[PDB]
Symmetry: D2
Subunit: 256 residues, 4 copies
Amino acid sequence: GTRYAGKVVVVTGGGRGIGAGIVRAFVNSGARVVICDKDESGGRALEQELPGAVFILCDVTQEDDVKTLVSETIRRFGRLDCVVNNAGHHPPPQRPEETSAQGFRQLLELNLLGTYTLTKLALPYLRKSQGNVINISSLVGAIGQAQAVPYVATKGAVTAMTKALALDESPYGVRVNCISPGNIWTPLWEELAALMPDPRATIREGMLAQPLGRMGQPAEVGAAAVFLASEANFCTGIELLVTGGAELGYGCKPSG
Amino acid sequence: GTRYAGKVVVVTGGGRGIGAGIVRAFVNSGARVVICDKDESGGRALEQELPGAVFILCDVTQEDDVKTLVSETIRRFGRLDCVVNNAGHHPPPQRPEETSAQGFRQLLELNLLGTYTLTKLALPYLRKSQGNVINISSLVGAIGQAQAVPYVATKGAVTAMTKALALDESPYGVRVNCISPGNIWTPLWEELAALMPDPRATIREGMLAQPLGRMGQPAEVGAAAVFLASEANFCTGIELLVTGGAELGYGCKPSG
Amino acid sequence: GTRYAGKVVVVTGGGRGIGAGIVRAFVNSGARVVICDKDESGGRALEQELPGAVFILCDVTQEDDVKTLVSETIRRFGRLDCVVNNAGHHPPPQRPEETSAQGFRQLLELNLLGTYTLTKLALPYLRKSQGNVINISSLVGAIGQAQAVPYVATKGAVTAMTKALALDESPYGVRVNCISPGNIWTPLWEELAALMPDPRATIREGMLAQPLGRMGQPAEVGAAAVFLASEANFCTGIELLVTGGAELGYGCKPSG
Amino acid sequence: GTRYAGKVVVVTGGGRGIGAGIVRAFVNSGARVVICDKDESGGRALEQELPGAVFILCDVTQEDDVKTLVSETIRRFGRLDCVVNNAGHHPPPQRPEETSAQGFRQLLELNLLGTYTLTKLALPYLRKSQGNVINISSLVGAIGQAQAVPYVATKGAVTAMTKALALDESPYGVRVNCISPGNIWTPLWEELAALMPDPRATIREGMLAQPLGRMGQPAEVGAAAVFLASEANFCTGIELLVTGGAELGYGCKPSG
Ligand SMILES: NC(=O)c1ccc[n+]([C@@H]2O[C@H](COP(=O)([O-])OP(=O)(O)OC[C@H]3O[C@@H](n4cnc5c(N)ncnc54)[C@H](O)[C@@H]3O)[C@@H](O)[C@H]2O)c1
Ligand SMILES: NC(=O)c1ccc[n+]([C@@H]2O[C@H](COP(=O)([O-])OP(=O)(O)OC[C@H]3O[C@@H](n4cnc5c(N)ncnc54)[C@H](O)[C@@H]3O)[C@@H](O)[C@H]2O)c1
Ligand SMILES: NC(=O)c1ccc[n+]([C@@H]2O[C@H](COP(=O)([O-])OP(=O)(O)OC[C@H]3O[C@@H](n4cnc5c(N)ncnc54)[C@H](O)[C@@H]3O)[C@@H](O)[C@H]2O)c1
Ligand SMILES: NC(=O)c1ccc[n+]([C@@H]2O[C@H](COP(=O)([O-])OP(=O)(O)OC[C@H]3O[C@@H](n4cnc5c(N)ncnc54)[C@H](O)[C@@H]3O)[C@@H](O)[C@H]2O)c1
Ligand SMILES: O=C(c1ccc(F)c(O)c1)c1cccc(-c2cccc(O)c2F)n1
Ligand SMILES: O=C(c1ccc(F)c(O)c1)c1cccc(-c2cccc(O)c2F)n1
Ligand SMILES: O=C(c1ccc(F)c(O)c1)c1cccc(-c2cccc(O)c2F)n1
Ligand SMILES: O=C(c1ccc(F)c(O)c1)c1cccc(-c2cccc(O)c2F)n1
Ligand SMILES: O=C(c1ccc(F)c(O)c1)c1cccc(-c2cccc(O)c2F)n1
Ligand SMILES: O=C(c1ccc(F)c(O)c1)c1cccc(-c2cccc(O)c2F)n1
Ligand SMILES: O=C(c1ccc(F)c(O)c1)c1cccc(-c2cccc(O)c2F)n1
Ligand SMILES: O=C(c1ccc(F)c(O)c1)c1cccc(-c2cccc(O)c2F)n1
Ligand code: NA
Ligand code: NA
Ligand code: NA
Ligand code: NA
């Protein structure tokens, strides 16, 4: 591909799931890609699989990991054009009274501050390249979700932060956007479903929450990321919904 | 009541349903209320029932009816402080291919242009009184609805128009706001349900579309209108949702 | 290009401005494009310029023009994969009291019902092809604009209609999306500015309404349309903002 | 007043500014009010001033302070009907590169986790009383703000959390809503302005960011809170904008 040829992209949590889909999309568009992940298994295999992708072990909650990720990217490829902040986690369903402040802090540390820290360290290089930032948020930041107060809160923060940063970085020509996926079939979706009393029913329900009648694919999020990086040159501070229409209309959720 | 004492309010479609609830709320707050409706039966009874409410027969799609409504209101009460554009209609469910341009035009004529025409004729008086406009839109203007392309379109227009007009009238101190109800139990809701194969099931489904587990009441929309008129003095161009949370979260509406 | 190779696209108002940018984007992506426009001058030249684009004279407010547009497209190319409803108009600034119901109706006829009519006639063919609809709305439908009550209302309607139709057509695999541009430098923008007391100042103000410090280009809207057609396969009922960030933050628009 | 007679309300950060306005609104509506604040000066005076208001020293970032606040409220008044999470802080303008992860964490601790902790400890009592939660968020959580990445992020989180919690608590009849003010003239606004090179200009600019041409008052936020507590019985998970229209239209913030 040539849509993003000559560009260098860092994808956090790129070892599996949505992140791996985004990695593949950017490789297919001609970019060189750095796969950041805290686990080795998926990302190492992906590096072997994909010419133009390399793997760097990095836990985005560890500031020295992230500093090394940025400096290794520059040392090896000489520029940085796009950072995709995809690393994140959805805890199992938890009733509000079953949550804790400390668990909330830990989830904020990954879903929000990990995105903040890489963005901050990358911005000097993105400014030189007139590059861009893509944050992977969630539809449920906008519309809410049951049994997920901490998670919903972290994604509300990511989406809002995206707009703040877009404002700050617009004078430098650096665009900052986010993608808000809905149900995307990933290993995390599979893991969460396996915890439920009836996994198969949870998966059917998840497929049917969308007017389109299926969950989304990592490749579909990847395509949206490539669009934001390579062609959305008048888009900054937007929230691109990749949800199959889940937010549309009424569903199951006289006046007394 | 004294929250809106000494004020004069016009409520279109005030003979039944949401409009009658709004009429009652304003009377209870101390205002004098003009009940506008194209049908006599409900509004005439309401005038007899409520001291401080009077009924004026007026079809908001007929410009001379509306001109007379405004001039009779001023002749009888000497001022005009609030116009509530509630008159409107939801056609039966219709698939897109079952709609027509002419039916769409007719629905626009009521739901949108009727609101426009009264607002336009009232604004000289609202400017003198630093009064305000309240448009009754719908949640489905924001989130969509199935088998209702014309209706959804008219309410998307009302909500957007509310913001445009708020901008234009802000220099004059005239606030313009809208209320977007969700399922409110009214005669129109009952009529629509009676068309369905199973009315009781349609009503149960409608009650359950809300996290709160019931439909809303006309009095609850009425209370929101009184708030916007009497106490929301720093609110203009807002969309106040009165929906029981229907827009929140996923509902019923693997990656292949 | 090959992103949308073998596909057939109809672009209304494709003779100049945003529509011509969209035409060019789709041609560059490998599609065959039908340029619909009520004026001959731009579209005829564009047909001569672009292999793979042809021009059909058609006024989208004339139902028989639109019926012929669809049947000629099928007769000449054998399928229809995407309809881009771009034709529309922004009247000069008008204070609310300077508007009329009949001017409002005429603007609704173009900006809203023209989009409705082509969509309706195209949908049988889009269903066979699992094609998609792209409506060109406006940011000001969402956030409002001064001295433009009718225009704002028409675009609020288009955006809402997009969501309604997405719901109705999702069972058939037909996606329905809209693009909401902000200030895009087009002949209409130039014409409107030329009416102002100071055209150059109006244009400078328009450039600065965006954090990015410039207006957008037709090609940038075109790229977003190609993305929605060719790669956004899990997107339906979305509003894709192409605005340069104009909706972000505070601007020029103690407690007494 | 009698709108909220017999009810017990806790207002955090009630010693001055918006919180004190909310305290006064609830007292005027007939409620008994607990003023929570980390500083004694304003709240102690307010307790002396207002029959029906009492002051409890409490730092919402200190879990044992908050536990004692709830148990003292129940011991002294026998019930709890509404919690208003108003305590929060806006740091001085800070460019993204001038922020730190640790400052971000500290701001999250106040603006987000303080709201979480009181809500969590109050919910058993709110469930018994079918009470409600009101969170004071900010417009800039929704639209962004320049030189305020941490602040914007915290308020995006509060607004999203409000919707999540509304979903979780709806089966228990507990409503959870938020108010998103824009520029409200408060001591914090005055303090921030005094840091600027030209305070008077910053204040003029702040007044003019609103179509209404002034900043809002604490009493106006207070009225909106009383409405949400006492009359918005079909509202849950909403974001009530109290902004003077700042989010409407274009402002100051050719295609090359
Ligand atoms: N799957 C969905 O339906 C869905 C929906 C909306 C949003 N999202 C978001 O998309 C993102 C990816 O989700 P997914 O479903 O692909 O999850 P996943 O669990 O399948 O994959 C996430 C990847 O990130 C890595 N990761 C986790 N913590 C990390 C850390 N500290 N440092 C580096 N890498 C780390 C994991 O090792 C893994 O390879 C997350 O931000 C999630 O919130 C997912
Ligand atoms: N009921 C709901 O669930 C619901 C939900 C969202 C929005 N709404 C909106 O609320 C409004 C009232 O709805 P409702 O459910 O109370 O309906 P309703 O049918 O029960 O009452 C509407 C009233 O308006 C009158 N009316 C109709 N056309 C008129 C005209 N041309 N001139 C004057 N009066 C006219 C009717 O005669 C009637 O008295 C409408 O704008 C509707 O779109 C209703
Ligand atoms: N230019 C902007 O800043 C801007 C911003 C937001 C939205 N938009 C929307 O984008 C669309 C295109 O705007 P533009 O700026 O390119 O305008 P334009 O005037 O430059 O071009 C519009 C084209 O549509 C054609 N057209 C008009 N009426 C028609 C009809 N009845 N049938 C067929 N063709 C018809 C015109 O002849 C012209 O070729 C419109 O829907 C407009 O509302 C424009
Ligand atoms: N003023 C505005 O324009 C504005 C706009 C939008 C949102 N807000 C929000 O409204 C709320 C109040 O703002 P304000 O302008 O009135 O501020 P303020 O500084 O004038 O008052 C805040 C009050 O909260 C108290 N407080 C601070 N930290 C506390 C803690 N840890 N525990 C207990 N009390 C604490 C302070 O002592 C003070 O009395 C905040 O959440 C703020 O983000 C304000
Ligand atoms: O056979 C693999 C595979 C990889 C990607 C594909 F698209 C595919 O079709 C297959 C493979 C091999 C080694 C490790 C992992 C792995 C990936 C992701 C996460 C993990 O934990 C892993 F162990 N996969
Ligand atoms: O990873 C999930 C997710 C799904 C949608 C998103 F928008 C998102 O950001 C994340 C997910 C997967 C399986 C079940 C649930 C779930 C359902 C229902 C309630 C819950 O608490 C759940 F966690 N979530
Ligand atoms: O007995 C009535 C009534 C009216 C309002 C009430 F709240 C109530 O408890 C009862 C009544 C009497 C005459 C006409 C109508 C009427 C109203 C509304 C619409 C109509 O079509 C009507 F005929 N009602
Ligand atoms: O009057 C209705 C309505 C309900 C919610 C709103 F937000 C609103 O503005 C209007 C209504 C009543 C009964 C069934 C349906 C319906 C359901 C499902 C599909 C439909 O096409 C329906 F008409 N609607
Ligand atoms: O020289 C032209 C041109 C056309 C497109 C280009 F990108 C370009 O660089 C140049 C041209 C020639 C004839 C008619 C029109 C025309 C187009 C659009 C609208 C009109 O009214 C027209 F007369 N243009
Ligand atoms: O064509 C315009 C437009 C610009 C933005 C959009 F989002 C849109 O859909 C349309 C436009 C061009 C020049 C001036 C004005 C204008 C400014 C200020 C006030 C007005 O009434 C204006 F017409 N508008
Ligand atoms: O004279 C006061 C006052 C209080 C409220 C009013 F509405 C009023 O018109 C006046 C006063 C007295 C003691 C402490 C504080 C105080 C309040 C709020 C914050 C503080 O830091 C304070 F010292 N005020
Ligand atoms: O307390 C503020 C605030 C104002 C609006 C809100 F919606 C809100 O939640 C908070 C405030 C006060 C004075 C200046 C600034 C400011 C302006 C411009 C840029 C900034 O970084 C600022 F802090 N803010
Ligand atoms: Na490789
Ligand atoms: Na009477
Ligand atoms: Na050609
Ligand atoms: Na007291």
